[PDB]
Design an enzyme around this catalytic site. Structure first.
Site, short mmCIF file in Angstrom:
data_model
loop_
_atom_site.label_atom_id
_atom_site.label_comp_id
_atom_site.label_asym_id
_atom_site.label_seq_id
_atom_site.Cartn_x
_atom_site.Cartn_y
_atom_site.Cartn_z
N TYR B 105 0.90 -1.15 0.00
CA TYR B 105 0.08 0.08 0.06
C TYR B 105 0.87 1.25 0.08
O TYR B 105 2.18 1.25 0.58
CB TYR B 105 -0.87 -0.03 1.35
CG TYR B 105 -1.96 -0.74 1.14
CD1 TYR B 105 -3.28 -0.32 0.88
CD2 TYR B 105 -1.87 -2.08 1.97
CE1 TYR B 105 -4.28 -1.22 0.85
CE2 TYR B 105 -3.10 -2.86 2.22
CZ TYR B 105 -4.52 -2.64 1.62
OH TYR B 105 -5.52 -3.35 1.82
N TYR B 144 -1.79 -10.02 1.40
CA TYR B 144 -0.66 -9.49 2.01
C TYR B 144 -0.79 -9.87 3.52
O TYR B 144 -1.74 -9.91 4.05
CB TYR B 144 -0.50 -7.73 2.00
CG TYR B 144 -1.54 -7.16 2.62
CD1 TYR B 144 -2.60 -6.87 1.68
CD2 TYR B 144 -1.50 -6.78 3.78
CE1 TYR B 144 -3.95 -6.29 2.06
CE2 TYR B 144 -2.90 -6.16 4.45
CZ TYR B 144 -4.03 -5.82 3.49
OH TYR B 144 -5.00 -5.26 3.67
N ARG B 154 -4.15 -11.32 4.50
CA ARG B 154 -5.48 -11.05 3.83
C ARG B 154 -5.65 -11.54 2.47
O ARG B 154 -4.58 -11.42 1.66
CB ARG B 154 -5.59 -9.44 3.82
CG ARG B 154 -5.36 -8.64 5.03
CD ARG B 154 -6.41 -8.87 6.08
NE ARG B 154 -7.90 -9.09 5.76
CZ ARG B 154 -8.71 -8.41 4.98
NH1 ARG B 154 -8.52 -7.20 4.64
NH2 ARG B 154 -9.88 -9.03 4.74
N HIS B 157 -8.29 -7.96 -1.98
CA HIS B 157 -9.14 -7.24 -1.78
C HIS B 157 -9.25 -5.78 -2.17
O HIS B 157 -8.13 -5.09 -2.15
CB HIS B 157 -9.97 -7.38 -0.09
CG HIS B 157 -8.60 -6.54 0.86
ND1 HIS B 157 -7.48 -7.33 0.97
CD2 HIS B 157 -8.76 -5.36 1.25
CE1 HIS B 157 -6.85 -6.54 1.74
NE2 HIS B 157 -7.48 -5.45 1.84
N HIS B 159 -10.99 -1.95 -0.89
CA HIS B 159 -11.69 -1.46 0.07
C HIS B 159 -12.74 -0.36 -0.55
O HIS B 159 -12.40 0.27 -1.51
CB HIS B 159 -10.79 -0.80 1.06
CG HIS B 159 -9.88 -1.43 1.88
ND1 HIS B 159 -10.42 -1.75 3.15
CD2 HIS B 159 -8.74 -1.56 1.55
CE1 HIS B 159 -9.32 -2.50 3.54
NE2 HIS B 159 -8.54 -2.57 2.60
FE LIG Z 1 -6.57 -3.68 3.13
#
Ligand SMILES: [Fe+3]
Ligand SMILES: [Fe+3]
Ligand SMILES: [Fe+3]
Ligand SMILES: [Fe+3]
Lengths: 200, 233, 233, 200, 233, 200, 200
Positions: B105, B144, B154, B157, B159
């Site tokens: 990210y 991740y 995770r 995905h 958000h």
């Molecule tokens: Fe996330």
């Protein structure tokens, strides 16, 4: 019985929410137009105030990655739904807590009175929604002002709170920041002095 | 100004994830211990911001151009926003954020060893059309690792945040991809008790919306709280 | 005076509702956090009052005459009180209270907008007979709204209190009516984890006991803790 | 294994319990004969005492809709099960807390010693069962007296409680009310100083 | 004037109850013995009154105000009128009548011992909107005994009359409430041979349309004969 | 084959039908505007007539709880669908049988001629629907006039009835009531002289 | 709902019923004690009468194999349940129709009046049950007397019959046989003047 389509289930905003909804805060380049913490331009009618607070978890520790959304009426008790950066006042805004100090701020005006569905006036209040990593579905709350004792004493919403001691958790404390009128509203998610959260 | 002319179907707090879901560690200390206080709907709750006048840039919804070309799986994510009665939600704000192709990210607090992509930001926004449609163009995000249990990851995905007609309808969720074996092992996903609710979060491969020799597509429809008119109040 | 000659089967605390049942909001602050301390049965626990000599009035059990005629569906509520071994519990006290046909209670704290009924009180008591039978005559209560979630309604119900042979057997519960669609939606009903236990609280339509051209009838049998003689103690 | 018929499951008494079990209290007309809070007539043998207390929830707030049932031995240590308003003493009673002040009262005599199943004497006590909205299945407890220290020390029941600090929660504090011998017994359902409750 | 431009799908007389259904005693003498004579549709059969200009009172559809407040379970009864093709039937006349909370009707001939309610009449009327929607506000009626078999009881029900676009579509029926255990025992209900047909008469609890802390709601959709254009006639 | 949604099934109107559709008759207060038995105002064009009759069950006993609905063209042979109490003529009306005498009456005009779908003229007629307790699905019939024998003989509808004798059951008998032209039309639900009922 | 054990289903008595319940009739030897058609001994108090009648089928043909049972109060309007051949009067009897003539006869006394459950007197009547081949379940009826018009008009049972014409089927016609007071009661199972049959 009758069942409609089910609503899409909520999920936590996660720790990187700022990249999507708080660009500057994520420390990333912003776009031309962003929805941020300044509801009123200096020339907006009403009593200009600064709002600030901290968010605490159940261990009494600061929640540094929170994201808040606010909704309030203007000084005349009117909801301004047409969002525009050109407006002198917007009823909607966004803020977040400092990864450092963990404090959020908002620049607005003290809201005017609005009546409930039964025509009873509600004390001046700001509607708040809180999101963060660890919060599966956002928490709803209201901020009321300690200088409106009279009106608060009669609010149909505050009066739905069973225990008077719990009501006090929704009252912001009038203060001054750099000789400017301010109100501090801290949120305690869990434990002692836990803040009242609503369902609606 | 906005007016109190609608009522919203009450949320099913058994369908949504509960506040306290221990496998998701952070939820332990960030969940109320007192019960939520139910209140009747008022103008305060039945109104919200309308974003029709926000000035959107031309590539606000195009993650391939809004930050060369990013590396990763070119995809279009599209779908419709409707209410529980099946009614489209026109001109509503849809905002998204995600990691890059390797699960990294573009945020200071992200220390994952997968590298950043110099051509990718990971933020998009789109106002729905008259028919409730939205669309985004991006790259498929990678899974991740995160510090929950010792080996938690995770599923890939995206958000999502959606405004809807009032503060009452506003929602933040996550989209997952059809067939990802990581789905059933995620404690976040698992905050949701009904497997049927889980399926509502899985975007489906949409070969019909793909651009041949260019990019694939996924379909993700969103359902907001039903809106009805007051009656005998 | 009372004698310590009996032992009562241990209660199944997974059959009965647990103390902490979050969906029932009030239970949060009103449930202990420490485990209960088990204690062996003594005379203190295995004895209790016998109400054979209470002076009951002639209409104690007839809600139609005990407070004009009430408005609502006239019904007889009858049944038998037995123990877990299936032995009848004779001469035992059965007390009941309920709302009127509109779901309004004759209590100061009841502010529901449904009117009181000038001819209805809502309280009855009956001593079981030699065979463990009891009977009441009243009107079917209406459902009612309550401040739990934003749209919660209790199913129509009658509150019951049964004394039994000892304080170990005393019980307070609620009667629900066969087929009522509000049953499976009530957080209070749901405080009960086994659906099979839920079935035990549903009174069945009893055409055989009805008075043609007059009133219907419901049957509701009650099972109190099994009573046995002490042995090898 | 052998399985008997299952016991009818319990349900909360609800906020309106008074209508059915504490008529006066609900502010409703009563019947000729009611089961109330006067176990002993002025002429019953034994030491006439007054009991009083308040019930607290986990937040430290008064529970104003509580209903209580008591069972005790007479002054000779005998359980009198034949209930009659004509009797000088009845071993059974009922009380409830004020919708206002939130306190219950009971007029009785100090119970005499009773032996457990194994022939060991228990200190003087009163068996109490607590009912209220939010309470799915009633709570059982016992009230012992602070002026029976010697006896308390040897109670086989009191001794079953692992932690001595917990034992203290069951001891009523002697006082005087209008120059009469009284004992105060508060019940804390949850949290700090949580009252011990029993299973039997 | 009216014109012959439509044809109505032929009725299924095996779906509707037959004329002679002996358990419903009164049908024995009030059912024809000869076959019905079939005739083609003409302007006579394909037209009917339009009630758009009837002067309806303000509370014609609110049985709580159209007669103090009535005693009983406050409910909204709403739904949609559509044809067999699923097309809504706009501005059509809907009339209803029922007993009070106790099974008592406000009519000369009703001598049932349950009392009349001084604040309740039991009649309503409503014109469907552009979308085919109607709604009524009333109290849930009580079941009542009738002289058929020695212990017959009608389930709680609301009588309905619907105009539709022509005399060919006009219908009289009865609404029953979800889960009522009397349903299966009723000789009237049983005049209908197909169980699936019976289901169409049962109104479903509609929590989405209820007014929190006020009244519950039932949903009852009505289907009239499909209307089509003439072709190759 | 193709199946559409099924039509809502019919149910008997029951004995209290008057309360909902014949207020006066139930002997209850009426509303401002009611649909009743007077299709034509004194000043409506055409020949003013009085209609009356009785309804018999299979035992030859009067049905005193019957409810009837009528549909007819004006004197010009036109169907007036816009219902209005201000109109001089309405094509739609309602009537009911006396709980006492058991006779219904209607005040209207003799309808003009209407063509069937093939363009063929139908004799003057009034479309009737009968409802009552004991009748599961309403009965459809037509009223023809004895003074229209010529038209009657040529009716494509009347001609569908196989047996000539059955056709007679449909003809109202001209009379006079207080020197007013009237026609009597008795309905026999079952048995000897059983009235023809249609399906369409 | 609660369901009890189901009652054993009825079946026709068949054509040879006489063999088990009307021995003489079957023309077979009888036992010492038989239950027959003489309810009163010459010396029984009250007005001695003779009952006779025929039974007709749907085609108007005599039913020559019927079996009937009767139950009636005594002259004082009392039911004498303890059957004994010694009794002066018995409230129960049995008769049958001649394979020849097709007529039954009973020797009794005119019954006294009894009150229904609500305390309202009923007109003097005889309860009858009919059995025969072709009848799956027995038919219940009552015999009333033509010389008790006043009582008849007030009978709460007779008043339950909808149409007054039907009531008449229940009235026996007084006559005289050999100078003895007799009453004739004919039963028509089906068709014209069909006798009223009850369910209780
Ligand atoms: Fe996330
Ligand atoms: Fe209750
Ligand atoms: Fe009815
Ligand atoms: Fe045989």
């Amino acid at each position: 019985p009758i069942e409609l389509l089910p609503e899409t289930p909520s999920q936590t905003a996660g720790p990187y929410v700022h990249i999507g909804l708080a660009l500057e805060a994520a420390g990333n380049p912003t776009r031309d137009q962003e929805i941020w913490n300044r509801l009123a331009k200096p020339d907006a009618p009403g009593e200009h105030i600064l709002l600030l607070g901290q968010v605490y978890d159940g261990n009494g520790h600061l929640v540094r990655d929170s994201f808040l959304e606010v909704w309030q009426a203007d000084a005349n008790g009117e909801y301004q739904d047409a969002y525009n950066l050109e407006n002198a006042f917007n009823s909607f805004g966004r803020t977040a807590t400092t990864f450092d100090a963990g404090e959020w701020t908002l620049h607005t005006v003290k809201p005017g009175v609005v009546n409930n569905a039964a025509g009873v006036p509600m004390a001046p209040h700001i509607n708040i929604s809180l999101f963060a990593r660890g919060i599966n579905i956002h928490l709803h709350t209201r901020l009321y002002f300690d200088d409106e004792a009279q009106a608060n004493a009669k609010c149909p919403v505050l009066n739905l709170i069973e225990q008077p001691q719990r009501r006090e958790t929704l009252i912001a404390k009038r203060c001054e920041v750099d000789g400017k009128t301010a109100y501090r509203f801290d949120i305690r998610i869990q434990g002692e002095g836990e803040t009242v959260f609503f369902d609606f | 100004p906005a007016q109190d002319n609608s009522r919203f179907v009450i949320r099913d707090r058994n369908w949504h994830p509960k506040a306290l879901t221990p496998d998701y560690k952070t939820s332990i200390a960030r969940s109320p211990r007192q019960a939520l206080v139910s209140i009747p709907q008022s103008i305060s709750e039945t109104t919200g911001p309308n974003f029709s006048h926000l000035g959107f840039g031309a590539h606000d919804h195009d993650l391939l151009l809004n930050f060369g070309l990013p590396i990763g799986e070119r995809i279009i994510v599209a779908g419709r926003v409707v209410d529980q009665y099946g009614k489209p939600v026109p001109n509503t704000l849809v905002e998204m954020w995600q990691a890059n192709a390797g699960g990294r990210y573009r945020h200071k607090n992200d220390r994952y060893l997968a590298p950043l992509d110099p051509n990718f930001g990971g933020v998009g926004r789109c106002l729905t059309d008259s028919d409730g449609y939205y669309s985004f163009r991006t790259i498929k995000p990678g899974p991740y690792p995160w510090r929950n249990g010792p080996n938690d990851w995770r599923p890939a995905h995206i958000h999502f945040g959606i405004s809807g007609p009032s503060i009452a309808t506003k929602l933040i969720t996550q989209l997952y991809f059809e067939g990802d074996p990581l789905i059933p092992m995620c404690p976040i996903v698992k905050s949701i008790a009904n497997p049927e609710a889980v399926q509502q979060l899985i975007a489906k491969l949409d070969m019909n919306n793909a651009n041949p020799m260019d990019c694939l597509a996924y379909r993700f429809d969103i359902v907001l709280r039903g809106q009805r008119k007051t009656h005998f109040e």
